[PDB]
Amino acid sequence: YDYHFEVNGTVVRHKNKGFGYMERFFELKESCDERSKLSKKQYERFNALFNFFEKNGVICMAKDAGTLNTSIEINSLAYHGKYDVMKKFIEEQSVSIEDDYKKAFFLACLGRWEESYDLYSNIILNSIDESNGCVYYLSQINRYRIYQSITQAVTQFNGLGLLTFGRHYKPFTDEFLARIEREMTNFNIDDLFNGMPFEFQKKYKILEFLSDNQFLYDDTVKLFELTNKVRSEMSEGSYSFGMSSDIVVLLRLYDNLRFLYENCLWSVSFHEFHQYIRNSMSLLIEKAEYERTRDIDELGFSFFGKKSGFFMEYYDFVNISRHFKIDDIKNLERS
């Protein structure tokens, strides 16, 4: 909590009573000469540190914040819906442990929920010997969700699915369901961060929220505090300069997708996370309509005398294609 990192890539002092170590770095960013007063080791560390942040999108301090045009790039193939090329990828041979993880998620997307779990079991036993901390914790966090998917699936095919389909399809063998019930039977996800070593606990605190359900409840409440405001100004004829409150959501929206895709997590396919995208993109496409229609005296267009017009780009189509049922899309057509 020493600093605060705004959504826009800007950073502001929060709890520093000592040297502004963040500030010197950005002072080292622009100073090419000072970048030359380092040893090659130290220079490479800066390069390892510099290459990380630009990929993390951190730009410069708030005091010198200029016109920031943050980029967005989703590269996960599943987000790109290339269901055929992955059907060859899963056929390929494994090279590394990180590659095995990448395949495991790809298996799930194709509906072959059966073999996914076993390789989720196959990766877990071989994981420790390389002493890579992360690759274990997310392998189980992914397991219990695709566990629940099987469990919630098997009842549904029994309860209603017979009416929906007319036959009692059985996608999962009897014996397989037994083992997963046994292995996870008393599994309480809460302690899982409370289990991993102190060595794990000091480096990888930032992965904590994915354990309980506070991660999905944490993000949503802000969208309720962000949405409650914007409708208020919509009924006030107000004008907001600079970054409008709606622009805050979009960065937050795309930030969530990237972290929840490229790490290959499996929470994308659940109903709750779909709830987040529905009420986020609804607010953005809602806000577009009000801008296109309102009055101004003289200075109204003098304030931000242009707009994004919600120029709906390619990813935005990819977003609305998945996450909305037919009924949900109709609700927006009306207003």
Partner 1 sequence: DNNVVECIKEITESSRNGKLVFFVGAGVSTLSDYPQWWRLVDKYHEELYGSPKKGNYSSDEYLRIPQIFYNVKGEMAFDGILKDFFQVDKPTNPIHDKILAMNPAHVITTNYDNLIDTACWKRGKYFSVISAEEDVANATSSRYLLKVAGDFRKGFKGENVVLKEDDYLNYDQNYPLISNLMKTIIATHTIVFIGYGLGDYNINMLLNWVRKLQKDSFHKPFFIRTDPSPIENETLIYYENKGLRIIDAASLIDSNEYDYLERYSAVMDLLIESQENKFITKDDEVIDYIYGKISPLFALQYIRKIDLKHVFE
Partner 2 sequence: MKTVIQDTADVYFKRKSDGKLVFTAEAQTASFSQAISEEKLRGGIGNKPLYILKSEKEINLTVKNAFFDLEWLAMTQGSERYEVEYRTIAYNPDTEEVYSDIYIQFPNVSPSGEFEMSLENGNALAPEIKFEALADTDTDEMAVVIEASRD
Positions in the binding site for partner 2 (CB under 8 A): 4, 8, 12, 14, 65-73, 145, 148-149, 152-153, 156, 158-164, 166, 168, 213, 216, 233, 236-243, 245, 247, 250-251, 267, 269-273, 297-299, 302-306, 308, 311, 313, 325
Residue 33 beta carbon to partner 2: minimum distance, rounded to whole angstroms? 28
Among 171, 197, 237, 300, binds partner 1 (CB under 8 A): 197
User: Does 183 help bind partner 1 (rule: CB under 8 A)?
Assistant: yes
Nearer to partner 1, 83 or 217 (CB): 217
| Residue 164 CB partners (closer than 8 Å, separation 6+) | none
Q: Cβ closer to partner 2: 122 or 149?
A: 149
**Considering the rule CB under 8 A, would residue 128 count as an interface residue with partner 1?**
yes
What is the distance between the alpha carbons of residues 12 and 60, in angstroms, rounded to a whole number? Answer: 10
Angle at which helices 97-109 and 134-159 cross, to 10°: 20
27, two tokens: 């002072």
Cα 70 from Cα 255, distance rounded (Å): 11
Beta bridge partners of 11: 5, 61
Residue in 296, 279, 294 with CA at minimum distance from that of residue 331: 279
* 169 lies in the binding site for partner 1 (CB under 8 A): no
| Residue 185 touches partner 1, criterion: CB under 8 A | yes
Query: Quick check: 198 and 176 in contact, CB under 8 A?
Result: no
Residue of 15, 88, 167, 182 interacting with partner 1 (CB under 8 A): 182
Per CB under 8 A, does 138 bind partner 1? Answer: no
Among partner 2, partner 1, none, the one that 270 touches (CB under a kind-dependent 5 to 8 A) is partner 2
Which residue number, 131 or 238, has a Cβ lying nearer to partner 1? 131
Residue 196 in the binding site for partner 1 (CB under 8 A): yes
Of 7-15, 73-81, 197-205, 305-313, which part binds partner 1 (CB under 8 A)?
Answer: 197-205
Give the burial string for 194-220 (b: 16+ CB within 10 Å, else e).
eeeeeebeeeeeebeebbbeeebeebe
Is 202 a binder of partner 1 (CB under 8 A)?
no
Report the partner that residue 237 touches, choosing among partner 1, partner 2, none (CB closer than 5 to 8 A by kind). partner 2
195 touching partner 1, by CB under 8 A:
yes
Report if residue 132 touches partner 1, rule: CB under 8 A. no
**146 touches 113 (CB < 8 A):** yes
Q: How many CB atoms lie within 10 A of CB 104?
A: 24
Partner interacting with residue 138 (select from partner 2, partner 1, none; CB below 5-8 Å by kind): none
The single residue among 186, 228, 238, 335 that binds partner 1, judged by CB under 8 A, is 186
**Which of 71, 70, 64 has its CA nearest to residue 23?**
64
Q: Which is nearer to partner 2, 130 or 191 (by Cβ)?
A: 191
Say if CB 58 and CB 5 are below 8 A apart.
Answer: yes
Name the region of 17 (left: φ>0; alpha: ψ -120 to 50; beta: rest).
alpha
Separation CA 282–CA 331 (nearest Å): 10
Residue 131 as a binder of partner 1 (CB under 8 A): the answer is: no
Residue 182 contacts which entry, partner 1, partner 2, none (Cβ below 5-8 A, type-dependent)? partner 1
Return d(Cα 106, Cα 91) in angstroms, integer: 11
Binding site for partner 1 (CB under 8 A): 124-125, 128, 140, 182-183, 185-186, 191-192, 195-199
